[PDB]
Design a protein around this ligand. Structure first.
Ligand SMILES: Nc1ncnc2cc(-c3cccc(S(=O)(=O)NC(=O)[C@@H]4CCCN4)c3)ccc12
Ligand SMILES: Nc1ncnc2cc(-c3cccc(S(=O)(=O)NC(=O)[C@@H]4CCCN4)c3)ccc12
Ligand SMILES: [Mg+2]
Ligand SMILES: [Mg+2]
Ligand SMILES: [Mg+2]
Lengths: 564, 572
C-alpha cells in the first residue's frame, strides 16, 4: 500500500516550477544544478520517460545506452574537446588518461556507427537513449530548467542520402508532436537556426509559458512559426519616401544613444539608425551592420552573413576608432571606410539622421543615392509584434516558449571528421548524412508546472499525475473506516488505478491533508468517514472542482472509472 | 513496424580482443549486445539493452514488494559530503575525482551512502516515518585499476543500491531479512542457480553481511558449503576448525638443524622428506601498537586469511606485512628462518597449529630450523585464534558435515552499517520517549550489469547463449525463406502481427539471401532466442510452419491453424 507515511516530504527558488517541485516533495538539491528525485517526483519522470520511449519505438528508433564518461580522443577528432567550451566537464582517471562527462553523444554514436555500419542494407537507422547528461552551466538556476546534471532523450540517425535524412527527420518531428500531445502540454513546433540564411534544417518544440526564455513568432493567418532568432523580417513600408530635406552636419554632444537623439533633436525614432561594427570573415577586417533606431540587431542573422565572422565578434572601441576615426555614438554610413550592410527597413528610409563618423556629430536629412550610394541590403533585425508575415499571409505575434525539444540536420560534419563511410549499392564511398534529435526530459517535468498551476499548487496533465486517486480517511484509527478505506484501496488498485492512501495520524489535520493532496496535484480525491459510511456515502472532489459532492458507496467504482 | 535483424544484429565483423577471455564477454560481443568505448566503458547495443531492462524490471518489482521507495540520486557529488564521512580520502584510487569550472571539487559516485544520509537528515524529522528504505537503479563509476572480464569488472556499471533507516537494531534486522528474502526472489525469478552466503563487511564496513553468488566455474570468489547443513560462507568469512581432535604425544626431541638455501615450505619438505603437515609458516605483520610486530603462524599446507589476521586486536588493520629489513632488525634472521622458539615479538598461532606435534620451524637463526618442536615441553603455547582459510574436506564450523568449496560470481551484497554514517554526519531523530537516536542503517547492492554477464557464465553451450526465460531479448525468431516472395512475406508479416498482439516479443529475420539459412539459424541460437519459426513456400502449400526450440535437436512441423495453442504451450 502506497501510504503517505512514506512518500510526502524557498530563497533559492524563483520560478514557480522550482518552488512547487520543492514544496510538493518531488526533488531535493544536493548542490548547484544537482537534484535528487524524491519518490513522488520519480513517478512523474518515469511517466514522461515511458511515453517518450513508446513514441521513439513507434518511429522505428532503436534504444541503446551509451556511457557518460567518454575518452577525450573521440572529442579531439570532432574538435569539440576544445570547441565545445567550459560547459564540458573534463577530468582525468588514475592513469592520467583524459575524459569528459557526456553533455551529448555525437562522437560516441559516430564511433559506434563506423564500427557497426558497413552495409547500405543497414540504412537508414536511428539510435536513441534516455540517459543522464552533464553540462557545467555557469550559473545553474531555475531548478530543473538550467541544471548541470539532467536527463535527455538523444537520438541519432544515419543516412546515405539527404532525402533519406528528410524522411526520418519528418518522422521524428511527427513523433515529437505525439509525445508532447500525449503529455497534455500546450506546445508549438517552430523553425530554428541551422547556421545559414534560409533552409529548414532545424526545428524547436516549445511549451508555451509566460516564464519562457525564448521568444517565438507565429503568423495569425498561416502555418508560419519560428524562433525570433530564425524569424524572417520584411518591412512594413512598401516604398522609399522621396527626399524632402538636404543633408547637413550638426553638432551633437552627449548624444551616444538613440534616446538622446530622439529626445534631444525631436526626431521620430523611425528616422534614426544604429551602426554596430563587427569583425568580418576576412582576417583583420570590420563590417558595419545597420538597423533602424527602434529595431534590434539579430546576432544570428548578423553572423550568418558571409562577410561577417561567425561566431559574431563586436569590434572594440579602439578598433572602431582606428578604422573610422570616431567612436560608438557617432557612427554611420556616410564617409564610412569599411564594408556596410543595412537592414531591409533601413533601405526604404528617408530624411534620416546618422552619426557622421566624426566625434559628437550627426548628419540629418540623409537620403540614399543622393547623399551616398545604398550599400548591400540584408535581413539583419528581429521581427517585432505586428510585423508582416514573411510568407505574405497575415501579421506576426510573439509568445514566450520553454524549449523542450530540438532537432537538427548535421550533414557530414561528424562523418567527415571521424571517417564514417559506407559503400553504396554502386560501390561508391559515402560519408553518412546524419540527424540528431533531443528532448529535455527533466525540463519537461518543470515545464508542465510552469504552464499548469494555480494558488493551491500543481495541476498535472492526466498522463503526468503521480497518482490518479487520493484516499483521505478521517480518523483511519477507527476500524470501521479502516476497513472501508482498505477495501476501497484494494478494489481501485485491482482495477488498475494508482492510489495514494493518506495514512497519517490525528496530528495531521484533515485540512492540511487536503492541501497536501492538491499541492502535489492529485487529480481526484475521495474522503471516508464514519459519518459517511453510516449513510453509505463517499465524498469525492476533483482537483479543479469548486465543491465536493457525495457519492453512494456502491456506484463509486463505476463513477471513478468514467472520470479515469 | 517490425523489429528486424537488419537493424538489430548490426555488423558481421565483431570485436575480438585479446583480453576477451571469459565466455560472457565473448558471447556478449559476438551476439551484438555490448560494444566497448574504452577501458571499462561499454555501450548497451539494442539487443543487449533489452536484457538489461528485464533484469531492472524484476529487481524493481521485488524492491517495491519489500516496501522500498525508489529515488534517483545524482552521479556527480560534492567532495564536502565525502569529507564528512572521511571517504574522500579513505576510499582510495577507485574514486574518480574532478573539478568543475569554479574549481569546486566533486567525485562521480561509486556508491551513495553520503548522499542518501544527507537526504535523510533533511527529510526524516519524525519517528513515525521510520522504518524507511530508499533505493535507486543508477549508473556508478569505479576506477577499477585493470578493467576486464567485460561487464564483470567494468568502470561504469549499473547498480541497484538501497539504504534503510531504523530506530533500533531489531527494526534493522526485520528490513535486512526482508531484503535477503527479496534478493532470493529476484535471482529465483531471473532463473539463476544462486546461493546466499555469510560474508565479511569489507571496506563498506559495519558488522553482519551476506553475499549472493551465481554458481559458475569462472567465479572469482571461493564460497564454502557444508555437505550436510545449510552452512554457507565466503572463504573470507568461513570459520576454520581443526580436523585433529587433540594434540598428539611428543615422540621426538627438539634439535637444531642446518638448512641453507631453505626459504620455502616446498624446499624444506623436499630437502628433508618432511610431511608438509609437520611444517609451519611464520608471517610477520605490523602490530596495532605503532612500531610493533606480530608473528602469525599457520600450518605449511594452509594459507593465512588476511581478513581474519587484520581482525585480531594485536594486528594492525588494514594488514601490513613487515619488510625484510624490519624482520631482520627485530629477530636477527630473515624470512625462511623464522618460528615461535626464542621469538622476541608477540605471536599468534592458528587453531590447527596448536594441536601439532613434532613439527619443524625456523630457528630465528639464519639458515637454521628446529625439528621435533612440541608445545609446553620446548616452549609455551602462545595465543590461539582462527587465522587460516578452510580447505576442502575440513569440518563444518557449525558441527554438521564437512566443507565443500565452489566458485561464485557475486551479484549482490547486503550490510548492517550501524551508526558509522549517522554519527559521522549527525543524522538523528527523537524517539517516542523524546530521546536523541542516531539512525541505525543498512545498505543493499545488486550488480545489475554483472547479473547479465553472470547469467551467460552459468548458462551457455557450443551454439552460444542460453538465456533463462525472463532474460531472453526475444522469445520467437521468424526466419522467412525468400521473404522477398509475396506469399512468404504476407504469411510472415501476418504471423508477426498475431504473435505480437498476444504479447510475445518477436524478431523477424529480413536479411536477403547473401545471409544463408544456416547462418541465420546459428545467429538466432548464438543470441539465445529460445524459439524459432521458419516460413517457406513448401511449408505454406502444406499449411504448416517449421518450428524448432533452442534446446531441441530436431525441427517439427506445425499446422498453421494450431499456432497460438502450440507456441503458448512452449512459452510456459
Ligand atoms: N542545463 C540543462 N538543464 C536541463 N535540461 C537541459 C536540456 C538541454 C537540451 C535538451 C535538448 C536538446 C539540447 S541541444 O543542445 O539543443 N541538442 C543536443 O544536445 C543534440 C540533440 C540530441 C543530441 N545532441 C539541449 C540542455 C541543457 C539543459
Ligand atoms: N567494477 C564493477 N563492474 C560491474 N559491477 C560492479 C558491481 C559492484 C558492486 C555491486 C554490488 C555491491 C557492491 S559493494 O561495494 O559490495 N557494496 C556497496 O556498494 C553498498 C551496497 C549499496 C551501496 N553500498 C559492489 C562493484 C564493482 C563493479
Ligand atoms: Mg558569416
Ligand atoms: Mg561618440
Ligand atoms: Mg586489528
Amino acid at each position: 500500500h502506497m501510504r503517505t507515511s512514506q512518500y510526502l516530504l524557498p530563497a533559492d527558488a524563483v520560478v514557480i516550477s522550482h518552488q512547487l517541485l520543492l514544496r510538493a516533495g518531488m526533488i531535493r538539491r544536493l548542490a548547484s544544478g544537482l537534484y535528487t528525485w524524491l519518490p513522488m517526483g520519480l513517478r512523474v519522470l518515469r511517466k514522461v520517460e515511458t511515453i517518450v520511449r513508446e513514441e521513439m519505438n513507434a518511429a522505428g528508433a532503436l534504444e541503446v545506452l551509451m556511457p557518460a564518461v567518454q575518452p577525450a580522443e573521440l572529442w579531439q577528432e570532432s574538435g569539440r574537446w576544445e570547441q565545445y567550451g567550459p560547459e564540458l566537464l573534463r577530468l582525468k582517471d588514475r592513469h592520467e588518461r583524459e575524459f569528459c562527462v557526456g553533455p551529448t553523444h555525437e562522437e560516441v554514436i559516430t564511433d559506434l556507427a563506423r564500427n557497426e555500419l558497413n552495409s547500405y542494407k543497414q540504412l537508414p537507422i536511428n539510435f536513441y537513449q534516455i540517459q543522464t547528461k552533464f553540462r557545467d552551466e555557469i550559473r545553474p538556476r531555475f531548478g530543473l530548467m538550467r541544471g548541470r546534471e539532467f536527463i535527455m532523450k538523444d537520438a541519432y540517425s544515419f543516412h546515405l542520402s539527404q532525402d533519406s535524412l528528410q524522411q526520418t527527420y519528418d518522422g521524428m518531428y511527427q513523433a515529437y508532436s505525439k509525445i508532447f500531445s500525449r503529455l497534455g502540454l500546450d506546445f508549438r513546433p517552430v523553425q530554428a537556426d541551422n547556421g545559414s540564411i534560409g533552409g529548414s534544417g532545424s526545428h524547436e518544440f516549445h511549451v508555451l509559458a509566460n516564464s519562457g526564455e525564448d521568444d517565438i513568432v507565429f503568423s495569425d493567418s498561416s502555418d508560419y512559426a519560428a524562433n525570433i532568432e530564425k524569424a524572417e523580417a520584411v518591412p512594413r513600408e512598401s516604398a522609399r519616401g522621396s527626399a524632402t530635406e538636404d543633408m547637413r552636419l550638426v553638432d551633437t554632444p552627449n548624444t551616444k544613444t538613440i534616446a538622446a537623439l530622439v529626445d534631444g533633436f525631436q526626431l521620430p525614432i523611425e528616422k534614426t539608425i544604429k551602426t554596430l561594427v563587427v569583425h568580418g570573415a576576412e582576417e583583420g577586417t570590420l563590417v558595419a551592420l545597420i538597423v533602424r533606431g527602434d529595431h534590434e540587431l539579430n546576432e544570428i542573422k548578423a553572423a550568418n552573413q558571409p562577410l561577417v565572422a561567425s561566431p559574431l565578434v563586436f569590434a572594440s572601441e579602439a578598433e572602431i576608432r582606428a578604422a573610422i576615426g570616431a567612436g560608438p555614438g557617432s557612427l554611420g554610413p556616410v564617409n564610412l571606410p569599411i564594408a556596410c550592410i543595412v537592414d531591409r527597413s533601413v533601405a526604404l528610409m528617408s530624411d534620416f539622421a546618422a552619426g557622421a563618423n566624426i566625434e559628437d556629430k550627426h548628419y540629418f536629412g540623409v537620403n540614399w543615392e543622393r547623399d551616398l550610394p545604398l550599400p548591400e541590403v540584408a535581413d539583419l533585425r528581429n521581427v517585432v509584434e505586428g510585423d508582416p508575415s514573411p510568407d505574405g499571409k497575415g501579421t506576426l505575434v510573439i509568445k514566450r516558449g520553454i524549449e523542450v525539444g530540438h532537432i537538427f540536420q548535421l550533414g557530414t560534419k561528424y562523418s567527415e571528421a571521424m571517417k564514417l563511410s559506407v559503400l553504396s549499392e554502386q560501390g561508391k564511398p559515402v560519408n553518412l548524412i546524419m540527424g540528431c534529435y533531443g528532448i529535455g526530459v527533466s525540463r519537461v517535468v518543470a515545464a508542465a508546472i510552469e504552464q499548469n498551476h494555480d494558488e493551491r499548487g500543481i495541476l498535472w496533465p492526466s498522463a503526468l499525475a503521480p497518482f490518479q486517486i487520493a484516499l483521505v480517511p478521517l480518523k483511519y484509527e477507527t476500524e470501521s473506516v479502516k476497513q472501508a478505506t482498505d477495501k476501497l484501496y484494494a478494489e481501485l488498485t485491482a482495477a488498475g488505478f494508482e492510489v495514494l492512501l493518506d495514512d497519517r495520524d490525528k496530528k495531521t489535520s484533515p485540512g492540511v491533508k487536503f492541501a497536501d493532496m492538491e499541492l502535489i496535484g492529485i487529480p481526484h480525491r475521495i474522503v471516508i468517514s464514519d459519518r459517511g459510511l453510516s449513510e453509505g456515502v463517499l465524498e469525492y472532489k476533483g482537483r479543479r472542482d469548486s465543491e465536493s459532492q457525495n457519492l453512494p458507496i456502491g456506484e463509486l467504482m463505476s463513477f471513478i472509472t468514467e472520470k479515469l
